[PDB]
C-alpha cells in the first residue's frame, strides 16, 4: 500500500511470501539433498536450472552464470516466475533431464571429493550436457584414449610431459618417454584416485599399478580439468569392461564399486620415525615422502578372526597398536581427532571376513 499526499511512499513490509513458497518446495520428494553432490538439507537453488543445492555446489554454479543463476532459499528475494520454475522442476526433474544418459561406470562425486571432481560433474551435466547427448561421451567411451600427461619423475620429483595410451583392446594403460612403451600397466591391477593436495596440483591424479605384491605410484596431471577427468573416467570404463568379461554373472551393481578405490585415510603417524601412511582397504603402506614411487614398507591388516587387533595407547601423544600373529606395530598420532579416525579405518578391516586373495596377500607379509 501507499501513504496519502505528495511524497506518497510505497511500503513493502515483512511478507517474504515468495521465498516462503520455495522453502515449502524443499519438502517435496527428491529435494531432500543436493542435486549435484548429494549433501543433505540443501538451502540454495539455481532458478534457471530449477535444482536445489548446497552452499558449496552453489559456489561452483556461480562460475557458470550463462547456465546457472543462484539464490539463497532464505536470504534472497525471489521474483514470482522464479518460484514457479522451482515449483515446476526440482531435483527429480533435473535427474531425468541432465542425468538421462550417465554411463554406469561414470564417477559421481561425494561431498568430500576434491573440487575438480565436483565442478566437472556440475559442468558435465548442465554446461556441456554430456548426459543428454551421447555423442559428447566419446572420449571415455571409445575404449581407446591417448594423449600427453605431465607425469612425476620416480625420484627427481619433476613433472614432465609424456604420451599415455589407454587401450581396452590390450587391456592396459601404457606410457612412452620412443619405440616400445616405457611401461605397460595391466588394467586388472590399475586403481586411480584424485589426490590434488598430495600431488600439489588441482588436477592431480594418482594411478597405482600392483605388480608382484609391489604397488608403484604414478602421479600425473593435465593442464585442462575436463581432460584429466575424461582420463579418469576412461580408466573406469576400462576397468568396468574388463571386469564384465573377467567376471560375467556378476551384475553391474556388484562391479561398479570395484572400479576404483579411494583411500579411507591418509596422513602422517610415527613408527620413532615420522612416516606417511595410506590405508587402502587392507594394506597400510608407509613412506618417507607422500609422492614416493614405492612403499618403504607395508603392513597387512587382517581380521579379528585371524588374530588381528588394533589397540589404543602404547605399552607423540595418542597411540594405536596393531597386534598381529607375528609381531606388534606401535603407531603414534599427533591429535585425538586423528587417532579416532585412523583407528576407525583399521577396525573396518578387523571386523570384516578375509577373502582368499587377501590370504594370498597376507601369506606374503
Ligand X SMILES: CCCCCCCC(=O)OC[C@H](COP(=O)(O)O[C@H]1[C@H](O)[C@@H](OP(=O)(O)O)[C@H](OP(=O)(O)O)[C@@H](OP(=O)(O)O)[C@H]1O)OC(=O)CCCCCCC
Which of another protein, Zn ion, ligand X, none lies near 150, with the C-beta cut-off 5 to 8 A by kind? another protein
Give the interface segment with another protein, choosing from 54-62, 165-173, 199-207, 329-337 (CB under 8 A): 199-207
Which of ligand X, Zn ion, another protein, none lies near 34, with the C-beta cut-off 5 to 8 A by kind? Zn ion
CB of 118 to another protein, least distance (A): 13
- C-beta separation of 279 from 265 below 8 A: yes
How far is residue 339 from each of residues 116, 316, 360, measured CA to CA in Å? 29, 11, 29
Q: 210 or 264: whose CB is closer to ligand X?
A: 210
Give the interface segment with another protein, choosing from 25-33, 105-113, 196-204, 210-218 (CB under 8 A): 196-204
Examine residue 51 and tell whether it contacts Zn ion (CB under 5 A). Answer: no
Which of ligand X, Zn ion, another protein, none lies near 39, with the C-beta cut-off 5 to 8 A by kind? Zn ion
Examine residue 158 and tell whether it contacts another protein (CB under 8 A). Answer: yes
**Options 45, 172, 199, 349; binder of another protein; rule CB under 8 A:** 199
Distance (Å, rounded) from C-alpha 40 to C-alpha 54? 8
Distance (Å, rounded) from C-alpha 154 to C-alpha 3? 78
Examine residue 55 and tell whether it contacts another protein (CB under 8 A). Answer: no
Please give the grid coordinates belonging to residue 240: 568396468
HEC string of the chain equals CCCCCCCCCCCCCCCCHHHHHHHHHCCCCCCCECCCCCCECCCEEECCCCEEECHHHHHHHHCCCCCCCEEECCCCCCCHHHHHHHHCCCHHHHHHHHCCCCCCCCCCCCCCCCHHHHHHHHHHHHHHCCCCCHHHHHHHCCCEEEEEEEEECCCCCCEEEEEEEEECCCCEEEEECCCCCCEEEEHHHEEEEECHHHHCCCCEEEEEEEECCEEEEEEEECCCHHHHHHHHHHHHHHHHHHHHHHCCCCCHHHHHHHCCCCCCEEEEEECCCEEEEEEECCEEEEECCCCCCCCCECCECCCHHHCCEEEECCCCCEEEEEECCCCEEEEEECCHHHHHHHHHHHHHHHHCCCCHHHHHHHHHC
- C-beta separation of 198 from 217 below 8 A: no
Q: 95 or 162: whose CB is closer to ligand X?
A: 162
- C-beta separation of 256 from 105 below 8 A: yes
Q: 125 or 151: whose CB is closer to ligand X?
A: 151
Q: 61 or 318: whose CB is closer to another protein?
A: 61
Q: 182 or 189: whose CB is closer to ligand X?
A: 182
Q: Give residue number: closest CB to ligand X.
A: 153
Please give the grid coordinates belonging to residue 25: 518446495
**Options 204, 255, 260, 342; binder of another protein; rule CB under 8 A:** 204
Q: 174 or 239: whose CB is closer to ligand X?
A: 174
- Which string of x and - marks every residue 264-283 that binds another protein (by CB under 8 A)? --------------------
Binding site for ligand X (CB under 6 A): 151, 153-156, 160, 162, 177, 182-183
Q: Of 132-151, which residues contact another protein (CB under 8 A)?
A: 150
Examine residue 232 and tell whether it contacts another protein (CB under 8 A). Answer: no
CB of 38 to Zn ion, least distance (A): 7
Examine residue 32 and tell whether it contacts Zn ion (CB under 5 A). Answer: no
Examine residue 200 and tell whether it contacts another protein (CB under 8 A). Answer: yes
**Options 77, 142, 160, 323; binder of another protein; rule CB under 8 A:** 160
Examine residue 34 and tell whether it contacts Zn ion (CB under 5 A). Answer: yes
Q: 45 or 192: whose CB is closer to another protein?
A: 192
Please give the grid coordinates belonging to residue 101: 544418459
Q: Of 175-234, which residues contact Zn ion (CB under 5 A)?
A: none
CB of 157 to ligand X, least distance (A): 8
Residues near another protein (CB under 8 A): 114-115, 150, 156-161, 196-202, 204, 223
Amino acid at each position: 500500500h501507499h501513504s496519502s499526499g505528495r511524497e506518497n511512499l510505497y511500503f513493502q513490509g515483512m511478507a517474504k511470501e515468495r521465498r516462503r513458497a520455495v522453502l515449502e518446495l524443499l519438502q517435496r520428494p527428491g529435494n531432500a539433498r543436493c542435486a549435484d553432490c548429494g549433501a543433505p538439507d540443501p538451502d540454495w537453488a539455481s532458478y534457471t536450472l530449477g535444482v536445489f543445492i548446497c552452499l558449496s555446489c552453489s559456489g561452483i554454479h556461480r562460475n557458470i552464470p550463462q547456465v546457472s543463476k543462484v539464490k539463497s532459499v532464505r536470504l534472497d528475494a525471489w521474483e514470482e516466475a522464479q518460484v514457479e520454475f522451482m515449483a515446476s522442476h526440482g531435483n527429480d526433474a533435473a535427474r531425468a533431464r541432465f542425468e538421462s544418459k550417465v554411463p554406469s561406470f561414470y564417477y559421481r562425486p561425494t561431498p568430500s571429493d576434491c573440487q575438480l571432481l565436483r565442478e566437472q560433474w556440475i559442468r558435465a551435466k548442465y554446461e556441456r550436457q554430456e548426459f543428454i547427448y551421447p555423442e559428447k561421451q566419446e572420449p571415455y567411451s571409445a575404449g581407446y584414449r591417448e594423449g600427453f600427461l605431465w607425469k612425476r619423475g620416480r625420484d627427481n620429483g619433476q613433472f614432465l610431459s609424456r604420451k599415455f595410451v589407454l587401450t581396452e583392446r590390450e587391456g592396459a594403460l601404457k606410457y612412452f618417454n620412443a619405440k616400445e612403451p616405457k611401461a605397460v600397466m595391466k588394467i586388472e591391477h590399475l586403481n586411480a584416485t584424485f589426490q590434488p593436495a598430495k600431488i600439489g596440483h588441482p588436477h592431480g591424479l594418482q594411478v597405482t599399478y600392483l605388480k608382484d605384491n609391489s604397488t608403484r605410484n604414478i602421479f600425473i596431471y593435465h593442464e585442462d580439468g575436463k581432460e584429466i577427468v575424461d582420463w579418469f573416467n576412461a580408466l573406469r570404463a576400462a576397468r568396468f569392461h574388463y571386469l564384465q568379461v573377467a567376471f560375467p554373472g556378476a551384475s553391474d551393481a556388484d562391479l561398479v564399486p570395484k572400479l576404483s578405490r579411494n583411500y579411507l585415510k591418509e596422513g602422517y603417524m610415527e613408527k620413532f620415525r615420522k612416516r606417511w601412511f595410506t590405508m587402502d582397504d587392507r594394506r597400510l603402506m608407509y613412506f618417507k615422502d607422500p609422492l614416493d614411487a614405492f612403499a618403504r614398507g607395508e603392513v597387512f591388516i587382517g581380521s579379528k578372526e585371524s588374530g588381528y587387533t588394533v589397540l589404543h595407547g602404547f605399552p607423540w601423544p595418542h597411540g594405536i597398536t596393531i597386534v598381529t600373529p607375528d609381531r606388534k606395530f606401535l603407531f603414534a598420532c599427533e591429535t585425538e581427532s586423528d587417532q579416532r579416525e585412523w583407528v576407525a579405518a583399521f577396525q573396518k578391516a578387523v571386523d570384516r571376513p578375509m577373502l582368499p586373495q587377501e590370504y594370498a596377500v597376507e601369506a606374503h607379509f
